[PDB]
Each structure stands twice: as C-alpha cells, then as structure tokens.
Design a protein around this ligand. Structure first.
Ligand SMILES: *[C@@H]1O[C@H](CO)[C@@H](O[C@@H]2O[C@H](CO)[C@@H](O[C@@H]3O[C@H](CO)[C@@H](O)[C@H](O)[C@@H]3O)[C@H](O)[C@H]2NC(C)=O)[C@H](O)[C@H]1NC(C)=O
Lengths: 49, 49
C-alpha cells in the first residue's frame, strides 16, 4: 500500500502606492503713479496605485 | 489675474482716470483606473481499476 502526495502552494501579493501633490501661489501688487495687480496660482496632483 | 490703473490730471480743470481688471482661472482633472484578475486551471483525474 504505497502513497505519493505532493503539495506546492505559492502566494504572491504586491501593492504599490504613489502620490504627488504640488501647489504654487504668487501675487504681486504695485500702487504709486498707477495701480497694478497680479495674481498667479498653480496646483498639480498626481497619484498612482 | 492682471490689473492696470492710471491717473493724471492738471488744471490750466482737468480729470482723467483709468481702471481695469482681468481675471482668469483654469482647472483640469483626469483619472484612469484599471483592475483585472484572471484564474484558469484544470483537474485531470484519471483512474485505472
Ligand atoms: C483619485 O483618488 C481618490 C481618492 O482615493 C478617488 O476617490 C474615490 O472615488 C470613489 C468614487 O465613488 C469613492 O467611492 C468609492 O467607490 C469604490 C468603487 O469605485 C467603492 O468600492 C468604494 O467603497 C467607495 O464607495 C471613494 O470613496 C473615493 N476615495 C476616497 C478615499 O474617498 C478617485 O476616484 C481617484 N480618481 C480617479 C479618476 O479614480
């Protein structure tokens, strides 16, 4: 009474998470001979999963 | 955003004034998400009696 068993269990799990966030704000104002106003806004968002 | 104003007067008042305003805003968003899962096996049970 011979027997012959073989079990080869394999489990692999990989997870990657990346997030990028960038924001820039600039404003300039000059009043003297003539009033001057300047505004600048920049926003960047990047996410990888 | 940009703005310019100018003012100059001289009595001999006289009157002169400039007023300007400019506003601009832009927003952009984009997302792409993909999920895939596959499994495929067999069970070839062969018995000889
Ligand atoms: C950018 O990332 C954000 C944050 O992870 C994502 O927001 C997620 O949007 C879903 C849309 O409904 C929110 O609901 C979820 O839906 C899934 C099915 O897709 C469901 O299984 C969840 O139980 C939940 O109801 C989810 O709550 C929200 N995440 C958070 C943290 O609030 C957004 O979708 C991403 N951008 C793109 C383009 O996918």
């Amino acid at each position: 009474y011979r027997v012959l068993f073989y079990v080869d269990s394999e489990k692999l799990k990989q997870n990657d998470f990346n997030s990028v966030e960038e924001k820039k704000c600039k404003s300039s104002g000059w009043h003297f001979v003539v009033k001057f106003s300047s505004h600048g806004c920049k926003e960047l968002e990047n996410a990888l999963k | 955003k940009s703005g310019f104003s100018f003012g100059f007067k001289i009595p001999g008042i006289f009157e002169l004034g400039i007023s300007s305003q400019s506003d601009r805003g832009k927003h952009y968003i984009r997302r792409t998400k993909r999920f895939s899962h596959t499994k495929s096996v067999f069970l070839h049970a062969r018995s000889d009696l």
